[PDB]
Amino acid sequence: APQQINDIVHRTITPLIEQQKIPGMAVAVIYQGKPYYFTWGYADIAKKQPVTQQTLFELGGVSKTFTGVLGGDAIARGEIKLSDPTTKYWPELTAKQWNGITLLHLATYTAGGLPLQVPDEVKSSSDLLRFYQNWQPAWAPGTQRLYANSSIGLFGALAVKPSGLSFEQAMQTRVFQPLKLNHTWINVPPAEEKNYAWGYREGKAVHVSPGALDAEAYGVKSTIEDMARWVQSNLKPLDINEKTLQQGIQLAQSRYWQTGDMYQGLGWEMLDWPVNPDSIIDNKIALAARPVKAITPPTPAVRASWVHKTGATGGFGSYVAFIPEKELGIVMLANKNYPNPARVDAAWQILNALQ
């Protein structure tokens, strides 16, 4: 890598790994549209397996960017509309509180207080219907944002219904395959287990547990190379040959709601660039309800934006950020769920230096 990139990356990440006691980490920097890779430490401490460019990390909530783009692709295909009532795709969802809740609200966490987590006890399709029928919103739709897997997770499940495909098959056929993300998975095949890093929580090796709507909300595993390809695809949607996928990426980066200096897209979140780390900045808060202002109509993807998404699972911490106008981006994958502010600070330090 150019010495400038090598130096800012190593000088930023080495201390981060030391301070946060991260077992293993992979970073990709996209500079002038070309990727540069860096790896440190261990994917499996006990078996002494190093992190490599082929190591699979759990993406956690960064998975929601794939769900948002798959949804965008379904809108582009004419299969669904964000303005459509949730009940159009799930007629059995007859409880009155669902009147007025559209797919847009599900995708952007504005349905009225859907919870962060789908309960453990909810597994089957009948259990899930019961959970949503019983849910009581705290707020009217489109008034407050509360980040939630049960919200964007339901959006993903409904968005693929008209296609006839399972969520995993739709994601594979419509997103992963066209973009050549051939080492990105919702379910890690046995052939790829040799590359699946262990996550570490309180020093114990752990992998994400199955749960309802996991694939749609937090279940993607990927390598640093495929994630760099994902950032390039989101930096330059026009180089993508598949027409509806190109549009879908664009729709996911549209600004639908504003809270403070932040704008909510489909999966992706955005701030106007330039921005300071203090404004970009947090997982220390378990539930953060914020009023939202609708952007009527949504602003098409703004190139001068800091576009990003954090992700965590019990044993992993991920972060992706890119600035379209500068053809610049970064992916940070780690097998420890360490504080979001430290991720944002490192990413900002690196991208600001490469401006």
Ligand SMILES: OC[C@H]1O[C@@](CO)(O[C@H]2O[C@H](CO)[C@@H](O)[C@H](O)[C@H]2O)[C@@H](O)[C@@H]1O
């Ligand atoms: O398996 C749970 C799964 O949900 C996430 C969010 O996608 O974590 C939430 O639930 C955990 C278990 O209840 C909490 O410890 C965590 O703080 C909460 O965000 C993922 O992190 C996790 O893989």
